[PDB]
Amino acid sequence: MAKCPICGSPLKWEELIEEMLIIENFEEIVKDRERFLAQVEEFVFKCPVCGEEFYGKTLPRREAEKVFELLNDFKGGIDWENKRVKLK
Ligand SMILES: [Zn+2]
C-alpha cells in the first residue's frame, strides 16, 4: 500500500500498473527490477484525492521491497489483452 506525502490518503499498487500499461517500453521494464524501481523514484505521480504531485524518491524504504514482489510473482493473474493486474 502507498500513502500520499501531501494529504495522507490510501493508494492501491494495482491502479499504478493498470494506468501505466499504455507504454510499449513497459514490457521491457517489467523483466528488470533495477530499471522499474529507478524509473518510479525519477518520475512523478498525481493524487486523485487532493490533486498535487508526489515523487517515488520521497516514498518509505519498506514499500520499495514490495515493488520486487510484483516483478518476481509473474504468470497467473496478469493479462495484456484484458489489462488485468493482480498483487499477492
Ligand atoms: Zn494526496
mmCIF file of all heavy atoms in Angstrom, residues 16-32 36 70-71 73-86:
data_model
loop_
_atom_site.group_PDB
_atom_site.id
_atom_site.type_symbol
_atom_site.label_atom_id
_atom_site.label_comp_id
_atom_site.label_asym_id
_atom_site.label_seq_id
_atom_site.Cartn_x
_atom_site.Cartn_y
_atom_site.Cartn_z
ATOM 1 N N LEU A 16 -1.694 1.840 -10.182
ATOM 2 C CA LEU A 16 -0.431 2.434 -10.732
ATOM 3 C C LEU A 16 0.120 1.683 -11.981
ATOM 4 O O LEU A 16 0.596 2.332 -12.926
ATOM 5 C CB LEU A 16 0.636 2.468 -9.624
ATOM 6 C CG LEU A 16 0.516 3.625 -8.628
ATOM 7 C CD1 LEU A 16 0.578 3.106 -7.199
ATOM 8 C CD2 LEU A 16 1.612 4.650 -8.869
ATOM 9 N N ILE A 17 0.044 0.303 -11.942
ATOM 10 C CA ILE A 17 0.489 -0.633 -13.040
ATOM 11 C C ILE A 17 -0.541 -0.614 -14.236
ATOM 12 O O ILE A 17 -0.117 -0.617 -15.403
ATOM 13 C CB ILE A 17 0.749 -2.152 -12.512
ATOM 14 C CG1 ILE A 17 1.467 -2.295 -11.073
ATOM 15 C CG2 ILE A 17 1.536 -3.016 -13.554
ATOM 16 C CD1 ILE A 17 2.742 -1.455 -10.742
ATOM 17 N N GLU A 18 -1.878 -0.594 -13.892
ATOM 18 C CA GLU A 18 -3.022 -0.567 -14.862
ATOM 19 C C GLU A 18 -3.120 0.760 -15.676
ATOM 20 O O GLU A 18 -3.487 0.723 -16.862
ATOM 21 C CB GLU A 18 -4.335 -0.817 -14.104
ATOM 22 C CG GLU A 18 -5.219 -1.884 -14.733
ATOM 23 C CD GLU A 18 -6.505 -2.099 -13.962
ATOM 24 O OE1 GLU A 18 -6.477 -2.818 -12.940
ATOM 25 O OE2 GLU A 18 -7.545 -1.547 -14.381
ATOM 26 N N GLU A 19 -2.780 1.908 -15.002
ATOM 27 C CA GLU A 19 -2.756 3.278 -15.587
ATOM 28 C C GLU A 19 -1.472 3.578 -16.410
ATOM 29 O O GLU A 19 -1.500 4.457 -17.295
ATOM 30 C CB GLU A 19 -2.846 4.318 -14.469
ATOM 31 C CG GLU A 19 -4.246 4.537 -13.892
ATOM 32 C CD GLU A 19 -4.269 5.602 -12.813
ATOM 33 O OE1 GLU A 19 -4.026 5.262 -11.637
ATOM 34 O OE2 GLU A 19 -4.529 6.779 -13.146
ATOM 35 N N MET A 20 -0.378 2.818 -16.106
ATOM 36 C CA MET A 20 0.947 2.978 -16.740
ATOM 37 C C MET A 20 1.244 1.883 -17.824
ATOM 38 O O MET A 20 2.327 1.899 -18.450
ATOM 39 C CB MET A 20 2.046 3.010 -15.651
ATOM 40 C CG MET A 20 2.172 4.345 -14.913
ATOM 41 S SD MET A 20 3.443 4.322 -13.632
ATOM 42 C CE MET A 20 4.864 4.922 -14.543
ATOM 43 N N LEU A 21 0.252 0.960 -18.066
ATOM 44 C CA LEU A 21 0.347 -0.160 -19.058
ATOM 45 C C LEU A 21 0.042 0.279 -20.546
ATOM 46 O O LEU A 21 -0.093 -0.575 -21.454
ATOM 47 C CB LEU A 21 -0.598 -1.296 -18.584
ATOM 48 C CG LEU A 21 -0.046 -2.731 -18.687
ATOM 49 C CD1 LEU A 21 0.498 -3.212 -17.343
ATOM 50 C CD2 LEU A 21 -1.127 -3.675 -19.186
ATOM 51 N N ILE A 22 0.010 1.627 -20.768
ATOM 52 C CA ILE A 22 -0.255 2.282 -22.090
ATOM 53 C C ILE A 22 1.048 2.531 -22.932
ATOM 54 O O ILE A 22 0.954 2.907 -24.119
ATOM 55 C CB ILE A 22 -1.099 3.629 -21.965
ATOM 56 C CG1 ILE A 22 -0.641 4.619 -20.841
ATOM 57 C CG2 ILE A 22 -2.573 3.301 -21.774
ATOM 58 C CD1 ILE A 22 -0.211 5.973 -21.364
ATOM 59 N N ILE A 23 2.232 2.288 -22.297
ATOM 60 C CA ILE A 23 3.589 2.464 -22.907
ATOM 61 C C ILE A 23 4.103 1.076 -23.381
ATOM 62 O O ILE A 23 3.952 0.072 -22.660
ATOM 63 C CB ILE A 23 4.674 3.153 -21.926
ATOM 64 C CG1 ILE A 23 4.098 4.317 -21.067
ATOM 65 C CG2 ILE A 23 5.890 3.727 -22.703
ATOM 66 C CD1 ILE A 23 4.230 4.112 -19.568
ATOM 67 N N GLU A 24 4.714 1.075 -24.606
ATOM 68 C CA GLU A 24 5.314 -0.138 -25.267
ATOM 69 C C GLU A 24 6.663 -0.587 -24.649
ATOM 70 O O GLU A 24 6.996 -1.781 -24.721
ATOM 71 C CB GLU A 24 5.481 0.079 -26.776
ATOM 72 C CG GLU A 24 4.202 -0.124 -27.579
ATOM 73 C CD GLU A 24 4.414 0.059 -29.069
ATOM 74 O OE1 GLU A 24 4.311 1.207 -29.546
ATOM 75 O OE2 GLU A 24 4.685 -0.948 -29.758
ATOM 76 N N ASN A 25 7.418 0.395 -24.050
ATOM 77 C CA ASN A 25 8.722 0.172 -23.339
ATOM 78 C C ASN A 25 8.554 -0.578 -21.982
ATOM 79 O O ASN A 25 9.508 -1.202 -21.493
ATOM 80 C CB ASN A 25 9.415 1.515 -23.089
ATOM 81 C CG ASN A 25 10.206 1.989 -24.291
ATOM 82 O OD1 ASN A 25 9.688 2.706 -25.148
ATOM 83 N ND2 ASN A 25 11.470 1.590 -24.359
ATOM 84 N N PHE A 26 7.300 -0.488 -21.402
ATOM 85 C CA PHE A 26 6.864 -1.123 -20.110
ATOM 86 C C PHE A 26 7.059 -2.659 -20.054
ATOM 87 O O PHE A 26 7.356 -3.203 -18.978
ATOM 88 C CB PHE A 26 5.400 -0.760 -19.804
ATOM 89 C CG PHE A 26 5.141 -0.404 -18.344
ATOM 90 C CD1 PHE A 26 5.328 0.897 -17.871
ATOM 91 C CD2 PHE A 26 4.726 -1.379 -17.440
ATOM 92 C CE1 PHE A 26 5.109 1.208 -16.542
ATOM 93 C CE2 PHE A 26 4.505 -1.068 -16.111
ATOM 94 C CZ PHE A 26 4.698 0.225 -15.662
ATOM 95 N N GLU A 27 6.880 -3.322 -21.243
ATOM 96 C CA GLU A 27 7.095 -4.802 -21.458
ATOM 97 C C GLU A 27 8.584 -5.224 -21.233
ATOM 98 O O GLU A 27 8.856 -6.374 -20.853
ATOM 99 C CB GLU A 27 6.669 -5.217 -22.878
ATOM 100 C CG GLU A 27 5.161 -5.339 -23.083
ATOM 101 C CD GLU A 27 4.792 -5.700 -24.507
ATOM 102 O OE1 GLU A 27 4.645 -4.777 -25.335
ATOM 103 O OE2 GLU A 27 4.652 -6.907 -24.797
ATOM 104 N N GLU A 28 9.512 -4.240 -21.489
ATOM 105 C CA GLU A 28 10.986 -4.372 -21.304
ATOM 106 C C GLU A 28 11.434 -4.045 -19.855
ATOM 107 O O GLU A 28 12.380 -4.674 -19.351
ATOM 108 C CB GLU A 28 11.725 -3.462 -22.300
ATOM 109 C CG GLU A 28 11.980 -4.113 -23.669
ATOM 110 C CD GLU A 28 13.338 -4.795 -23.763
ATOM 111 O OE1 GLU A 28 14.351 -4.083 -23.925
ATOM 112 O OE2 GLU A 28 13.383 -6.040 -23.671
ATOM 113 N N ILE A 29 10.725 -3.051 -19.202
ATOM 114 C CA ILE A 29 10.964 -2.583 -17.780
ATOM 115 C C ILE A 29 10.481 -3.681 -16.749
ATOM 116 O O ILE A 29 11.160 -3.896 -15.733
ATOM 117 C CB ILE A 29 10.323 -1.123 -17.469
ATOM 118 C CG1 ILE A 29 10.835 -0.038 -18.472
ATOM 119 C CG2 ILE A 29 10.652 -0.598 -16.025
ATOM 120 C CD1 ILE A 29 9.770 0.894 -19.058
ATOM 121 N N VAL A 30 9.310 -4.344 -17.050
ATOM 122 C CA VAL A 30 8.670 -5.431 -16.192
ATOM 123 C C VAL A 30 9.562 -6.715 -15.983
ATOM 124 O O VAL A 30 9.295 -7.507 -15.064
ATOM 125 C CB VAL A 30 7.204 -5.857 -16.664
ATOM 126 C CG1 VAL A 30 6.196 -4.758 -16.329
ATOM 127 C CG2 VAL A 30 7.061 -6.234 -18.173
ATOM 128 N N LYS A 31 10.561 -6.894 -16.896
ATOM 129 C CA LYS A 31 11.557 -8.006 -16.872
ATOM 130 C C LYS A 31 12.798 -7.712 -15.974
ATOM 131 O O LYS A 31 13.485 -8.670 -15.562
ATOM 132 C CB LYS A 31 12.019 -8.312 -18.309
ATOM 133 C CG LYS A 31 11.087 -9.240 -19.081
ATOM 134 C CD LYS A 31 11.577 -9.458 -20.504
ATOM 135 C CE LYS A 31 10.651 -10.384 -21.272
ATOM 136 N NZ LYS A 31 11.117 -10.599 -22.669
ATOM 137 N N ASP A 32 13.054 -6.396 -15.672
ATOM 138 C CA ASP A 32 14.191 -5.938 -14.844
ATOM 139 C C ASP A 32 13.728 -5.002 -13.709
ATOM 140 O O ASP A 32 13.229 -3.880 -13.948
ATOM 141 C CB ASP A 32 15.271 -5.255 -15.718
ATOM 142 C CG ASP A 32 16.146 -6.247 -16.459
ATOM 143 O OD1 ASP A 32 16.992 -6.894 -15.808
ATOM 144 O OD2 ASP A 32 15.982 -6.377 -17.689
ATOM 145 N N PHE A 36 12.751 -0.698 -13.079
ATOM 146 C CA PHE A 36 11.374 -0.370 -12.578
ATOM 147 C C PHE A 36 11.398 0.529 -11.302
ATOM 148 O O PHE A 36 10.647 1.509 -11.248
ATOM 149 C CB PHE A 36 10.555 -1.675 -12.320
ATOM 150 C CG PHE A 36 9.034 -1.553 -12.501
ATOM 151 C CD1 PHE A 36 8.420 -2.005 -13.664
ATOM 152 C CD2 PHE A 36 8.229 -0.992 -11.506
ATOM 153 C CE1 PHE A 36 7.051 -1.903 -13.832
ATOM 154 C CE2 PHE A 36 6.861 -0.889 -11.674
ATOM 155 C CZ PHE A 36 6.273 -1.344 -12.838
ATOM 156 N N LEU A 70 5.930 -7.850 -7.163
ATOM 157 C CA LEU A 70 5.107 -7.823 -8.428
ATOM 158 C C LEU A 70 5.897 -8.345 -9.665
ATOM 159 O O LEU A 70 5.319 -9.021 -10.532
ATOM 160 C CB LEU A 70 4.495 -6.410 -8.735
ATOM 161 C CG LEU A 70 5.368 -5.138 -8.578
ATOM 162 C CD1 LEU A 70 6.062 -4.786 -9.889
ATOM 163 C CD2 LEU A 70 4.519 -3.967 -8.102
ATOM 164 N N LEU A 71 7.226 -7.999 -9.699
ATOM 165 C CA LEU A 71 8.217 -8.428 -10.731
ATOM 166 C C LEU A 71 8.597 -9.942 -10.624
ATOM 167 O O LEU A 71 8.780 -10.602 -11.660
ATOM 168 C CB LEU A 71 9.487 -7.566 -10.617
ATOM 169 C CG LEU A 71 9.442 -6.200 -11.321
ATOM 170 C CD1 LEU A 71 9.739 -5.075 -10.342
ATOM 171 C CD2 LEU A 71 10.425 -6.165 -12.480
ATOM 172 N N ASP A 73 6.615 -12.340 -8.816
ATOM 173 C CA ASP A 73 5.364 -13.135 -8.837
ATOM 174 C C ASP A 73 4.596 -12.920 -10.181
ATOM 175 O O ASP A 73 3.413 -12.489 -10.236
ATOM 176 C CB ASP A 73 4.528 -12.804 -7.574
ATOM 177 C CG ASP A 73 3.732 -13.996 -7.059
ATOM 178 O OD1 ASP A 73 2.712 -14.346 -7.690
ATOM 179 O OD2 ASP A 73 4.131 -14.576 -6.026
ATOM 180 N N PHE A 74 5.336 -13.243 -11.273
ATOM 181 C CA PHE A 74 4.862 -13.169 -12.677
ATOM 182 C C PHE A 74 4.274 -14.510 -13.143
ATOM 183 O O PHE A 74 4.754 -15.582 -12.743
ATOM 184 C CB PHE A 74 6.014 -12.737 -13.609
ATOM 185 C CG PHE A 74 5.747 -11.475 -14.413
ATOM 186 C CD1 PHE A 74 6.019 -10.212 -13.887
ATOM 187 C CD2 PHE A 74 5.234 -11.555 -15.703
ATOM 188 C CE1 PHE A 74 5.782 -9.070 -14.628
ATOM 189 C CE2 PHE A 74 4.995 -10.413 -16.444
ATOM 190 C CZ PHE A 74 5.270 -9.171 -15.906
ATOM 191 N N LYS A 75 3.210 -14.423 -14.023
ATOM 192 C CA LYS A 75 2.402 -15.573 -14.622
ATOM 193 C C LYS A 75 1.389 -16.139 -13.598
ATOM 194 O O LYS A 75 1.791 -16.718 -12.561
ATOM 195 C CB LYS A 75 3.249 -16.729 -15.269
ATOM 196 C CG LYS A 75 3.522 -16.537 -16.751
ATOM 197 C CD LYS A 75 4.492 -17.591 -17.275
ATOM 198 C CE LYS A 75 4.714 -17.464 -18.786
ATOM 199 N NZ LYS A 75 3.641 -18.143 -19.571
ATOM 200 N N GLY A 76 0.085 -15.908 -13.908
ATOM 201 C CA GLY A 76 -1.034 -16.351 -13.066
ATOM 202 C C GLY A 76 -2.301 -15.544 -13.292
ATOM 203 O O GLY A 76 -3.241 -16.056 -13.931
ATOM 204 N N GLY A 77 -2.300 -14.291 -12.761
ATOM 205 C CA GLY A 77 -3.450 -13.363 -12.871
ATOM 206 C C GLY A 77 -3.156 -12.035 -13.575
ATOM 207 O O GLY A 77 -3.795 -11.025 -13.224
ATOM 208 N N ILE A 78 -2.203 -12.044 -14.552
ATOM 209 C CA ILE A 78 -1.809 -10.834 -15.332
ATOM 210 C C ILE A 78 -2.082 -11.132 -16.826
ATOM 211 O O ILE A 78 -1.509 -12.089 -17.380
ATOM 212 C CB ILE A 78 -0.282 -10.358 -15.117
ATOM 213 C CG1 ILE A 78 0.239 -10.547 -13.667
ATOM 214 C CG2 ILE A 78 -0.091 -8.863 -15.469
ATOM 215 C CD1 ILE A 78 1.401 -11.510 -13.561
ATOM 216 N N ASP A 79 -2.964 -10.292 -17.430
ATOM 217 C CA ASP A 79 -3.357 -10.388 -18.851
ATOM 218 C C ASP A 79 -3.115 -9.059 -19.570
ATOM 219 O O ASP A 79 -3.517 -7.990 -19.066
ATOM 220 C CB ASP A 79 -4.830 -10.812 -18.985
ATOM 221 C CG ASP A 79 -5.024 -12.312 -18.841
ATOM 222 O OD1 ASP A 79 -4.632 -13.057 -19.767
ATOM 223 O OD2 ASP A 79 -5.573 -12.741 -17.805
ATOM 224 N N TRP A 80 -2.425 -9.155 -20.741
ATOM 225 C CA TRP A 80 -2.068 -7.994 -21.625
ATOM 226 C C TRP A 80 -3.220 -7.533 -22.560
ATOM 227 O O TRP A 80 -3.311 -6.330 -22.861
ATOM 228 C CB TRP A 80 -0.810 -8.309 -22.451
ATOM 229 C CG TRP A 80 0.470 -8.259 -21.634
ATOM 230 C CD1 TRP A 80 1.106 -9.338 -21.090
ATOM 231 C CD2 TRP A 80 1.262 -7.099 -21.252
ATOM 232 N NE1 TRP A 80 2.221 -8.940 -20.398
ATOM 233 C CE2 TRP A 80 2.343 -7.579 -20.481
ATOM 234 C CE3 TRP A 80 1.175 -5.704 -21.477
ATOM 235 C CZ2 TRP A 80 3.312 -6.736 -19.941
ATOM 236 C CZ3 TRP A 80 2.143 -4.876 -20.938
ATOM 237 C CH2 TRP A 80 3.197 -5.394 -20.178
ATOM 238 N N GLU A 81 -4.073 -8.511 -23.004
ATOM 239 C CA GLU A 81 -5.257 -8.278 -23.901
ATOM 240 C C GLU A 81 -6.501 -7.725 -23.148
ATOM 241 O O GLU A 81 -7.242 -6.905 -23.719
ATOM 242 C CB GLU A 81 -5.641 -9.578 -24.641
ATOM 243 C CG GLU A 81 -4.742 -9.924 -25.828
ATOM 244 C CD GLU A 81 -5.129 -11.234 -26.488
ATOM 245 O OE1 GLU A 81 -4.657 -12.294 -26.025
ATOM 246 O OE2 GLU A 81 -5.901 -11.199 -27.471
ATOM 247 N N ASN A 82 -6.695 -8.196 -21.879
ATOM 248 C CA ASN A 82 -7.817 -7.789 -20.990
ATOM 249 C C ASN A 82 -7.445 -6.628 -20.021
ATOM 250 O O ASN A 82 -8.350 -5.989 -19.456
ATOM 251 C CB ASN A 82 -8.298 -9.008 -20.187
ATOM 252 C CG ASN A 82 -9.264 -9.878 -20.970
ATOM 253 O OD1 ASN A 82 -8.859 -10.825 -21.646
ATOM 254 N ND2 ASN A 82 -10.551 -9.557 -20.888
ATOM 255 N N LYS A 83 -6.087 -6.337 -19.851
ATOM 256 C CA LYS A 83 -5.479 -5.261 -18.955
ATOM 257 C C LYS A 83 -5.825 -5.433 -17.425
ATOM 258 O O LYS A 83 -6.298 -4.494 -16.728
ATOM 259 C CB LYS A 83 -5.753 -3.812 -19.499
ATOM 260 C CG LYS A 83 -4.834 -3.394 -20.633
ATOM 261 C CD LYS A 83 -5.184 -2.007 -21.141
ATOM 262 C CE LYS A 83 -4.232 -1.559 -22.236
ATOM 263 N NZ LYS A 83 -4.567 -0.199 -22.740
ATOM 264 N N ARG A 84 -5.566 -6.678 -16.937
ATOM 265 C CA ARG A 84 -5.791 -7.081 -15.525
ATOM 266 C C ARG A 84 -4.455 -7.376 -14.834
ATOM 267 O O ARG A 84 -3.625 -8.139 -15.371
ATOM 268 C CB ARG A 84 -6.734 -8.303 -15.415
ATOM 269 C CG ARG A 84 -8.211 -8.010 -15.719
ATOM 270 C CD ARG A 84 -9.091 -9.265 -15.641
ATOM 271 N NE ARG A 84 -9.416 -9.662 -14.240
ATOM 272 C CZ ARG A 84 -10.186 -10.721 -13.833
ATOM 273 N NH1 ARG A 84 -10.768 -11.592 -14.682
ATOM 274 N NH2 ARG A 84 -10.371 -10.903 -12.533
ATOM 275 N N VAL A 85 -4.272 -6.736 -13.652
ATOM 276 C CA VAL A 85 -3.047 -6.871 -12.804
ATOM 277 C C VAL A 85 -3.487 -7.324 -11.387
ATOM 278 O O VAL A 85 -4.413 -6.722 -10.811
ATOM 279 C CB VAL A 85 -2.145 -5.534 -12.704
ATOM 280 C CG1 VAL A 85 -0.674 -5.845 -12.333
ATOM 281 C CG2 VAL A 85 -2.121 -4.679 -13.997
ATOM 282 N N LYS A 86 -2.806 -8.384 -10.874
ATOM 283 C CA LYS A 86 -3.060 -8.952 -9.532
ATOM 284 C C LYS A 86 -1.796 -8.920 -8.663
ATOM 285 O O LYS A 86 -0.693 -9.235 -9.151
ATOM 286 C CB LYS A 86 -3.571 -10.401 -9.653
ATOM 287 C CG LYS A 86 -5.088 -10.527 -9.904
ATOM 288 C CD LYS A 86 -5.865 -10.825 -8.622
ATOM 289 C CE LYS A 86 -7.358 -10.951 -8.890
ATOM 290 N NZ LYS A 86 -8.120 -11.268 -7.651
#
